[PDB]
Amino acid sequence: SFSGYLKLTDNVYIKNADIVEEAKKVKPTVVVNAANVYLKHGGGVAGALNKATNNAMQVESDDYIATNGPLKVGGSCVLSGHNLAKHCLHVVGPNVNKGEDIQLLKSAYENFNQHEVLLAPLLSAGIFGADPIHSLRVCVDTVRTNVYLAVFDKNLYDKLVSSFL
Ligand SMILES: CNCC(=O)Nc1cc(C)ccn1
Numbered sequence: 001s002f003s004g005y006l007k008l009t010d011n012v013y014i015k016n017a018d019i020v021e022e023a024k025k026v027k028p029t030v031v032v033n034a035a036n037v038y039l040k041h042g043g044g045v046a047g048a049l050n051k052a053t054n055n056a057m058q059v060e061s062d063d064y065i066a067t068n069g070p071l072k073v074g075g076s077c078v079l080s081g082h083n084l085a086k087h088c089l090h091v092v093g094p095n096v097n098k099g100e101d102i103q104l105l106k107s108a109y110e111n112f113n114q115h116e117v118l119l120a121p122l123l124s125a126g127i128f129g130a131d132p133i134h135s136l137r138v139c140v141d142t143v144r145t146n147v148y149l150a151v152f153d154k155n156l157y158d159k160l161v162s163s164f165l
Pocket of ligand 1: 017018019020044045048121122126150151152153
C-alpha cells in the first residue's frame with residue numbers, strides 16, 4: 001500500500017513524489033488526473049500520466065470526448081487507469097491561467113468523495129496557476145475520503161508541510 005506519507009489530517013496524507021512513479025509502484029484503485037475539459041493531456045500531471053500510458057490515456061479520452069463532449073470545470077469522469085491504476089478519475093480544477101473561477105476548486109475536490117481512496121495531485125496547482133497552499137487547504141476542508149497527495153516539487157512539498165495549519 002501507500003508508504004512514506006506524512007499524515008496531515010484524519011484522511012489526508014502527503015508525500016514528495018512523482019505521481020507517475022507512485023502510481024506504477026502502488027497500482028492504486030484510483031489515480032486522479034489534473035485534467036482539462038477537453039481531456040487533452042498535454043503537460044503537467046496530465047501530460048506525464050498520459051506519456052506513462054504510451055498515449056493510451058489520450059486515445060481513450062478522445063473517444064470519451066467524441067461521445068460525451070467536454071467536461072465541466074469542477075467536473076470529472078472515470079476512465080481506465082491503464083498500466084497506472086484500476087481507474088483514472090479525470091478531475092478538472094479551474095485554470096487560473098485561463099481566468100477560470102477559483103471558487104470551482106471546492107467543486108473539483110468534491111469529486112474525490114465518490115472514491116474511498118485515491119492517489120492524487122493538488123488540483124489547480126502547477127500549470128493551472130492556483131496557489132498550491134490554497135489547493136491543499138480546500139482539499140483538507142472538502143475531501144472526506146482517504147486521499148494520498150503526491151507533490152512533485154520538493155521545495156513546494158516542504159513549503160506545504162511547514163505552512164500547514
Ligand atoms: C514529467 N514529470 C513528472 C511529473 O511532473 N509528475 C508530477 C507532477 C506534479 C505537479 C505532481 C506529481 N507528480
